[PDB]
Structure formats: structure tokens, C-alpha cells
């Protein structure tokens, strides 16, 4: 039938787009970033990210829909709090905004009528009072900013952003994806900082990650927080490292280990050099030997013949971070390809 042929044409178009996307998506490198504290995670991310307009250009319709949904929330605040508009006609305009939101039309092109009514609503002292009473009814202050500038959001039709906050996504928390390129490789680094939840449940989703980047701090050799119940950062870092190293989903996934804060470590070891975390350590009270012992403590956790740990010492002011990851990734991929052939 003609109807089935039309369905087949739609299906073929879907399959074609899915295949083209899969083709481009596969040409990449995936890196998972882990640590057992604040560590050097933020340092390594800032260093790796040497896209800036990418999100700005892409979220215009998001800021727009947040602006309208918030304005409807303000109208709800208006009726909940008992704050009236000076011009009672604006209440009808307030209803229009709520209907736009309740109709799920707040992402649609913004008409002249919507701009006229919303600008009339925004200039009323009762809307500013609704924000003044935002402590009773919860309102979005960023949307307040965009509403003050609503004339531009509407009249211009499109503008990448009016704020450099990047929507903040403070609540987004969760997984933070950092995209970058270096030489001829693209990378996606997954900074999983917001998952204050059980790792067993979410770790499997990264089973196919090309490599794991693990950041620890050398200065943590004697750094004990009250939250750590007398245990120092070095031991928490080693326990997490061992847990991930022998995880059933990462048996063959290589680890790139960064030992950060080498300057603070080298200065701190003048007093009590590595005695506090590793009381059994015996050797010169020097930067090189203490660092070698710590690295050995991390190296000893690799129990798989098909896995290796790359180690590099860093400093916040040490910019040689992107080449180290690039080279480690190259060697990881080569090793995996060599095992495919079985040479090696």
C-alpha cells in the first residue's frame, strides 16, 4: 500500500540519520575522570581545556523558555501572595502567559502579542514585589534578569546569550562533559563530580571508556580531614584507586594516574617525610625517593596483564598535561590493536 511505502520512507530516513550520526560519533576518544576528593580534578580539567560559543549559541531557546516558564511562575506568585497589578487588565495578560506555559508552547516563536503583554506585565510594581516576596513563592532570579531584558530577547528573535553564566547548570551538577581536541584526536572527558551516589549502580555505563584518568595529591600524604575519621587523603586515594583498578567492568581499561601538588609535597616532606601515611617507608628524606615510593604504592594495585598505569607528576603551574594524556591514549590504543592481531 501507499501508506506502508510512506512508513518505509520515514523509516529509511531515520535509519540513514542514525547511521550517519553513529559514523561520526565513533571517531572519538573517551576518558573518565576519577578521584577521592577535591584533589587535582579541577586543576587537571582546567589544564586540559587549554565549544566556548557552542553552548551559548545552542541555549538561546532554553533561556527563552526558562524566561516564559518563570514569568508564569511569577503570575502564580501573584495570585498566591495576594499582590495585585496596578492595571487590572494585565491580569488577563498574566493568564495568557500561564496558558502559554500550560500549553507547552513556551519554546515556540515569540509573537508580537506575547512581547506586548509580557512587557506590560514586567513593568508593573507587583511583579517586582513578587520577586521581593520570592522567599515565600520561589522564583528564578536569572529569569528575572532575562525578563528585565525581555525586549531584546523578543525583538531580536535570536541572540546567543545575555549572560556569561552559561545557564550556570549549578543544579545540573551530575556529569560534566568536557570536549576538546589535540593534534589529530578528539576527546570527551567525563568529570563525574556530582554523582554523590552508589558507584556500583552507575560505573558500568563507562565500561567502554577508552581510558580512566585518576588524580591524587602528593600533599595528601599527611592531610587528614575531620570527615575522614583520622584517615588521610593518600589512603583514601589508594583505596579508591584499588577499588576501580579491580572493578569487574574495568579489567582491561588502562589508567592514567596524575600525582598533583608536587611542589607542596616536596616542601612538606622536609618535616615527617612520608612517615605519617606510610610509617614503614624507609629511604632518603628527599622529593625523588618519597615520590617513587608513593608511585610504587599506586603501581602495585595493577593486577591485570592487559592493563598498565601511566604516571606523571604535575604542578598547578605545570602545563605539560595535554601531551601526557595524548601519548598515554595513543599507547593504550596501540596496545589494544596489537592484542587484536595477537602480536605482543
Amino acid at each position: 500500500s501507499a501508506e506502508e511505502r510512506a512508513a518505509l520512507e520515514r523509516s529509511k530516513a531515520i535509519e540513514k540519520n542514525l547511521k550517519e550520526d553513529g559514523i561520526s560519533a565513533a571517531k572519538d576518544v573517551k576518558l573518565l575522570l576519577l578521584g577521592a576528593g577535591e584533589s587535582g580534578e579541577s586543576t587537571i580539567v582546567k589544564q586540559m581545556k587549554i565549544f566556548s560559543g557552542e553552548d551559548v549559541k545552542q541555549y538561546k531557546p532554553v533561556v527563552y523558555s526558562n524566561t516564559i516558564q518563570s514569568l508564569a511562575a511569577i503570575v502564580r506568585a501573584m495570585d498566591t501572595l495576594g499582590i495585585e497589578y496596578g492595571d487590572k487588565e494585565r491580569k488577563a495578560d498574566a493568564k495568557m502567559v500561564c496558558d502559554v506555559v500550560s500549553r507547552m508552547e513556551d519554546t515556540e516563536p515569540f509573537s508580537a502579542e506575547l512581547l506586548s503583554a509580557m512587557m506590560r506585565l514586567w513593568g508593573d510594581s507587583g511583579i517586582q514585589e513578587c520577586f521581593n516576596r520570592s522567599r515565600e513563592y520561589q522564583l528564578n532570579d536569572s529569569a528575572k534578569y532575562y525578563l528585565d531584558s525581555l525586549d531584546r530577547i523578543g525583538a531580536a528573535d535570536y541572540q546567543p546569550t545575555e549572560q556569561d553564566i552559561l545557564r550556570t547548570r549549578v543544579k545540573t551538577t551530575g556529569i560534566v562533559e568536557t570536549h576538546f581536541t589535540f593534534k589529530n584526536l578528539h576527546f570527551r572527558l567525563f568529570d563525574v563530580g556530582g554523582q554523590r551516589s552508589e558507584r556500583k549502580k552507575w560505573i558500568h555505563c563507562f565500561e567502554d571508556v577508552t581510558a580512566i584518568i585518576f588524580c591524587v595529591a602528593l600533599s595528601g600524604y599527611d592531610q587528614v580531614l575531620h570527615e575522614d575519621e583520622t584517615t588521610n587523603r593518600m589512603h583514601e586515594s589508594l583505596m579508591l584507586f584499588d577499588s576501580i583498578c579491580n572493578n569487574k567492568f574495568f579489567i582491561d581499561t588502562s589508567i592514567i594516574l596524575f600525582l598533583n601538588k608536587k611542589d607542596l609535597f616536596g616542601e612538606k616532606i622536609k618535616k615527617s617525610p612520608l612517615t605519617i601515611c606510610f610509617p614503614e617507608y624507609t629511604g632518603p628524606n628527599t622529593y625523588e625517593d618519597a615520590a617513587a615510593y608513593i608511585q610504587a604504592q599506586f603501581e602495585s594495585k595493577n593486577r591485570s596483564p592487559n592493563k598498565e598505569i601511566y604516571c606523571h607528576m604535575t604542578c598547578a603551574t605545570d602545563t605539560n598535561n595535554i601531551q601526557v594524556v595524548f601519548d598515554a591514549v595513543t599507547d593504550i590504543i596501540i596496545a589494544n590493536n596489537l592484542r587484536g592481531c595477537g602480536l605482543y
Binding site: 506502508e4 512508513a7 518505509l8 520515514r10 523509516s11 531515520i14 535509519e15 540519520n17 542514525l18 550520526d21 553513529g22 560519533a25 565513533a26 516558564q69 508564569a72 511562575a73 502564580r76 506555559v101 500550560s102 507547552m104 519554546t107 543544579k171 545540573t172 551538577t173 551530575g174 556529569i175 563525574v192 556530582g194 554523582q195 554523590r196 551516589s197 552508589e198 556500583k200 549502580k201 552507575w202 555505563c205
Partner: protein, 339 residues
């Protein structure tokens, strides 16, 4: 002082609940069903294979017409399939590829998904353009979304890795009710046939029966030792079943406030990832980590048959409303329709 008095009172109340349980737990389904015939051997075969995902499939759900199937995978594409022809109907790109749950609205107008980004995204499938766009984003969770299920077009129930569930108003985009009382991450939700009650399973292994309108936990059930990964309701709404990492499935009755039956086998050392019931409730299906799905006789605690066409862990199961077909999905990127 006050803390010790309250802890002792809590222990006394738990003991009273346990004794109240013993007052009724003087029978079991495994004995009363000795008077009925077994279902016999079930030999289901695949009738359709659905290809298209390039990554592990994490979620699947059947619509109310028994024809349109929705699935989601690590590719970041939510795909709506015509289960009779294998024709694809929709492919919805996601803003975040870390998707773990999806649902299909009973009206056929909306779909939902979410995952590790802590945002529940509601999509409108019935548009004038013919394209599918995000209709709403539900923000406010502080952990990953483990299950999303629609009650109606304007109301959705979410569950997250933040020890809580919530009832969301889709049109407003805000939480209206929250469900607290869990201590571990919550893994799954199942809604009652009448939409008024729902259940949740938790890492602490205490599944709970929640009152949607009251906003509180009405009943707490225990029995598993490890995390509960899947939960579903018995078709008549008076019973539910859970699957856990203990390679065990358990059937509970809400009015008895009891565990009725334990499903286990000596050769099952893999956990349960999905649980579902047939239209009559006679069959219980569960997906396992050994790349198959066992079909249990829900009234016998035995094995009715096995579906074993997958090359990786089974991630999702579903049964049509009329019982005509069973769908499976796994980490091998394929979906299968069994009959």
C-alpha cells in the same frame, strides 16, 4: 536520653510489626497452589528483531496500543518502533546520552527519559511540525534518575539516586509531591493499575508502597539481602514482585503485608535486571545477567521456559497490555519480540 528512648521505641514498633506479620504468615502460595495444574512448558520464539541502536540499550516501554514500542540506549537516541512491521516511527536525539530510564504515556502523546544528568525530559510526540522536541525538563533531583513512569499527561512520577521519589506536574514544571523515607539509592518504580498507589525498590532492599495523593510511605516490605533492581505490579493491583542482586525474585501481597513467594534456582548466579507479569498474572518474567530471560510460573515458583537469544546482559522487559507479545532488550543493542 531522648535519642535512646526513640531508638528503643522504634525497635519495639518493628517487633510489633514482625509479630503482626506472623499473625497472618501461616500459609504460603507455594502450598495452596498444589491444587492447580502447571502451565506446562512454554516455548516462545522470536517473531521480530529490531535493529538500529549502536549502543547498550538501557530502557524500553510498551504503549497502550500494544503496537508502538519505545527504547533508549547509550547512543542518546530515543526510538519509537512499530512492533508489527519493524518500521521505525521516531528517533529523538537527546541532550544527554547518559540515559537509563524511559516511559511511554498511556495516551500516546508523550514520552520521557532521563539518567545521569539528573533531569527528566518530557517529549511531545503529537506536534503540528511532525518533529519531536523537548516539551519540558524537570529539574530538582540531586542524583541520577532510575525510573520514570507517567500517571497521566500532566503528571509524572520520578525516582532518583538521591533517596527519594517525586510526583511532578508536567505542565508547570515543578515538583508537587515528594516521597522520602529511603536511605539508599532508589532503583525502580511501578504504578498501580488505578494510578493511586505506586511502589519503589531501594538499594537498602526495603521496597515501599507509596500513596500518590497523600505523599507518604504506606507500607514497607523487606526480604532481599542486596539491592533491588526491578519492581512491577501484579495485574490486579493487589500484589507486586521484585528482583534483586541476590539472584532472587520475590512476590508480595499488599493487603496481606506479606511475602508470598520466593523465586530462585540453584543454577542462577546472575542478578535480576527486569521483572514483568503476563496479562493474567500467571507468568512472571525476569531478565538476568547471564544473557537470558527466565519465564517463571508465578503460582508455582518453578521455571516455565527460557528466552535466550541475547549476547549480553538483559536490560529491559515488557509485556503488551493484551498479553499478545513480550519484548526484551539487552546490552547487545538489539530488541526482540517474543511470542
Amino acid at each position: 536520653s531522648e535519642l535512646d528512648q526513640l531508638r528503643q521505641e522504634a525497635e519495639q514498633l518493628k517487633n510489633q510489626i514482625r509479630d503482626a506479620r506472623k499473625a497472618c504468615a501461616d500459609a504460603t502460595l507455594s502450598q495452596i497452589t498444589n491444587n492447580i495444574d502447571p502451565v506446562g512448558r512454554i516455548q516462545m520464539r522470536t517473531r521480530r528483531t529490531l535493529r538500529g541502536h549502536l549502543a547498550k540499550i538501557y530502557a524500553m516501554h510498551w504503549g497502550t496500543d500494544s503496537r508502538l514500542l519505545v527504547s533508549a540506549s547509550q547512543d542518546g537516541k530515543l526510538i519509537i518502533w512499530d512492533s508489527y512491521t519493524t518500521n521505525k516511527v521516531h528517533a529523538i536525539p537527546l541532550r544527554s546520552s547518559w540515559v537509563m530510564t524511559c516511559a511511554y504515556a498511556p495516551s500516546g502523546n508523550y514520552v520521557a527519559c532521563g539518567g545521569l544528568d539528573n533531569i527528566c525530559s518530557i517529549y511531545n510526540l503529537k506536534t503540528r511540525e511532525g518533529n519531536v522536541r523537548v516539551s519540558r525538563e524537570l529539574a530538582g533531583h540531586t542524583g541520577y534518575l532510575s525510573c520514570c513512569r507517567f500517571l497521566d499527561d500532566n503528571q509524572i512520577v520520578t525516582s532518583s539516586g538521591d533517596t527519594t521519589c517525586a510526583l511532578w506536574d508536567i505542565e508547570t514544571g515543578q515538583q508537587t509531591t515528594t516521597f522520602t523515607g529511603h536511605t539508599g539509592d532508589v532503583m525502580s518504580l511501578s504504578l498501580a493499575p488505578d494510578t493511586r498507589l505506586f511502589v519503589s525498590g531501594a538499594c537498602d532492599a526495603s521496597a515501599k508502597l507509596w500513596d500518590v495523593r497523600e505523599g507518604m510511605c504506606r507500607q514497607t516490605f523487606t526480604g532481599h539481602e542486596s539491592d533491588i533492581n526491578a519492581i512491577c505490579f501484579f495485574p490486579n493491583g493487589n500484589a507486586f514482585a521484585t528482583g534483586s542482586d541476590d539472584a532472587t525474585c520475590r512476590l508480595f501481597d499488599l493487603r496481606a503485608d506479606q511475602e508470598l513467594m520466593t523465586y530462585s534456582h540453584d543454577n542462577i548466579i546472575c542478578g535480576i535486571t527486569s521483572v514483568s507479569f503476563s496479562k493474567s498474572g500467571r507468568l512472571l518474567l525476569a531478565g538476568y545477567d547471564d544473557f537470558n530471560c527466565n519465564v517463571w510460573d508465578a503460582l508455582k515458583a518453578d521455571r516455565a521456559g527460557v528466552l535466550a537469544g541475547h549476547d549480553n546482559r538483559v536490560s529491559c522487559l515488557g509485556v503488551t497490555d493484551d498479553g499478545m507479545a513480550v519484548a526484551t532488550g539487552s546490552w547487545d543493542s538489539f530488541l526482540k519480540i517474543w511470542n
